[PDB]
Design an enzyme around this catalytic site. Structure first.
Site, PDB file in Angstrom:
ATOM      1  N   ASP A 184      -7.851  -1.236  31.071  1.00  0.00           N
ATOM      2  CA  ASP A 184      -7.918  -1.788  32.115  1.00  0.00           C
ATOM      3  C   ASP A 184      -8.762  -3.087  31.450  1.00  0.00           C
ATOM      4  OD1 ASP A 184     -10.439  -2.456  33.687  1.00  0.00           O
ATOM      5  OD2 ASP A 184     -11.892  -1.021  32.680  1.00  0.00           O
ATOM      6  N   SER A 215      -8.990 -20.395  38.591  1.00  0.00           N
ATOM      7  CA  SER A 215      -7.443 -21.032  39.190  1.00  0.00           C
ATOM      8  C   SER A 215      -8.148 -22.230  40.476  1.00  0.00           C
ATOM      9  CB  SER A 215      -7.706 -19.411  40.469  1.00  0.00           C
ATOM     10  OG  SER A 215      -7.195 -20.425  41.777  1.00  0.00           O
TER      11      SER A 215
HETATM   12  N1  6LY Z   1     -12.692  -2.983  35.267  1.00  0.00           N
HETATM   13  C1  6LY Z   1     -13.910  -2.839  34.762  1.00  0.00           C
HETATM   14  C2  6LY Z   1     -15.209  -1.879  35.898  1.00  0.00           C
HETATM   15  O1  6LY Z   1     -15.792  -1.775  35.612  1.00  0.00           O
HETATM   16  C3  6LY Z   1     -15.181  -3.982  36.695  1.00  0.00           C
HETATM   17  C4  6LY Z   1     -15.708  -3.956  38.129  1.00  0.00           C
HETATM   18  C5  6LY Z   1     -15.479  -5.671  38.533  1.00  0.00           C
HETATM   19  C6  6LY Z   1     -16.054  -6.518  37.084  1.00  0.00           C
HETATM   20 BR1  6LY Z   1     -17.133  -7.942  37.822  1.00  0.00          BR
HETATM   21  C7  6LY Z   1     -16.003  -6.488  36.361  1.00  0.00           C
HETATM   22  C8  6LY Z   1     -15.945  -4.721  35.576  1.00  0.00           C
END
Ligand code: 6LY
EC number: 3.4.23.22
Length: 330
Positions: free
Chosen positions: A35, A199
């Protein structure tokens, strides 16, 4: 040093990807969701509330000769999708695709929320955002990548996610056979702890490219592509019958539709997401309404280049002193 591990979709929709990770001595192999949007390595464990474990493989630190309790340390995390977990912390040896880190913080779950319990295929998370987001208290811990970095041949990892197919996470090297053309690098802000970049614009299908700055994060732990409402409306306006459904919670479209591609800019380069990547299938079993893979970020506070976008590219997470992101077609 280097490492290389295969990452595999958990289901037929590519909702997430799991990568095998060796923890402890002898090795206990758990399948973790890598992640780039968080910074905790946490696992289902022998300490997880029994009613909250359903088919996951657990880490048992008492069976690892290299595990050590990190005395007094606790963790607690809440994710963007509303899920959460918390527990205590061990240090242990962790290996990914041949790359070993000793003394890695392995956060052992005492509690997980229902969405984790319900997903039998994910045994935990391995965070690859910046260590400033790590939730361990009172002593913040480093990610696997940060711990490995000084040992790596080059201070990088790459994500090469597959569409309805396995892909690869590499650490310490760029596989020049894994992409076409050249990698375009773009600046990263670490101010919020994320791989945050800008972007340079977008196109819908064969339409003209719109030059416009879109600030967002490269997040392998988010399934979909979340973009400004203007951009998302422009996309779905090209799909007959598409609409935003408040009941479902986003854009849906007739399953009979063909979807246009979506292009995003990386500097002067372009990454094309094929239309099929944007199809997330029936909203419920047997429905002829399908869920869209491009959704509005309105109310998130930031745009998210999740798996839908990232899997269309070979992506370099460059953790040099000044971090950058690289994107290539493949
Ligand atoms: N993939 C981690 C999750 O908690 C997440 C979702 C959205 C955002 Br903006 C940051 C992190």
């Amino acid at each position: 040093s280097t490492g290389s591990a295969t990452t595999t979709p958990i289901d037929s929709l590519d909702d997430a990807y799991i990568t095998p990770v060796q923890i402890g001595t002898p090795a206990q192999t758990l399948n973790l969701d890598f992640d780039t949007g968080s910074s905790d390595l946490w696992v289902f464990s022998s300490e997880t509330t029994a009613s909250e474990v359903d088919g996951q493989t657990i880490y048992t630190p008492s069976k690892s000769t290299t595990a050590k309790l990190l005395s007094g340390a606790t963790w607690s995390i809440s994710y963007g999708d509303g899920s959460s977990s918390s527990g205590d912390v061990y240090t242990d040896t962790v290996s990914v695709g041949g790359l070993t880190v000793t003394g890695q913080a392995v956060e052992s779950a005492k509690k997980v929320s229902s969405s984790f319990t319900e997903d039998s295929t994910i045994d935990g998370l391995l965070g690859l955002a910046f260590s400033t987001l790590n939730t361990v208290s009172p002593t913040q811990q480093k990610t696997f990548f940060d711990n490995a970095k000084a040992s790596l041949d080059s201070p990088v990892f790459t994500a090469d996610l597959g569409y309805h197919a396995p892909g690869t996470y590499n650490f310490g090297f760029i596989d020049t056979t894994a992409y076409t053309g050249s990698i375009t690098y773009t600046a990263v802000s670490t101010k919020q702890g994320f791989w945050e970049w800008t972007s340079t614009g977008y196109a819908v299908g064969s339409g003209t490219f719109k030059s416009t700055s879109i600030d967002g994060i490269a997040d392998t732990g988010t399934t979909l592509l979340y973009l400004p409402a203007t951009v998302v409306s422009a996309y779905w306006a090209q799909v007959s019958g598409a609409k935003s459904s408040s009941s479902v919670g986003g854009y849906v479209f007739p399953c009979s539709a063909t979807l246009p591609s979506f292009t995003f800019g990386v500097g002067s380069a372009r990454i094309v997401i094929p239309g099929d990547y944007i199809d997330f299938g029936p909203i419920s079993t047997g429905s002829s309404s399908c869920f869209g893979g491009i959704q509005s970020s309105a109310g998130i506070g930031i745009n998210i280049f999740g798996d839908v976008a990232l899997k269309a590219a070979f992506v370099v997470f460059n953790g040099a002193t000044t971090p950058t992101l690289g994107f290539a077609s493949k």
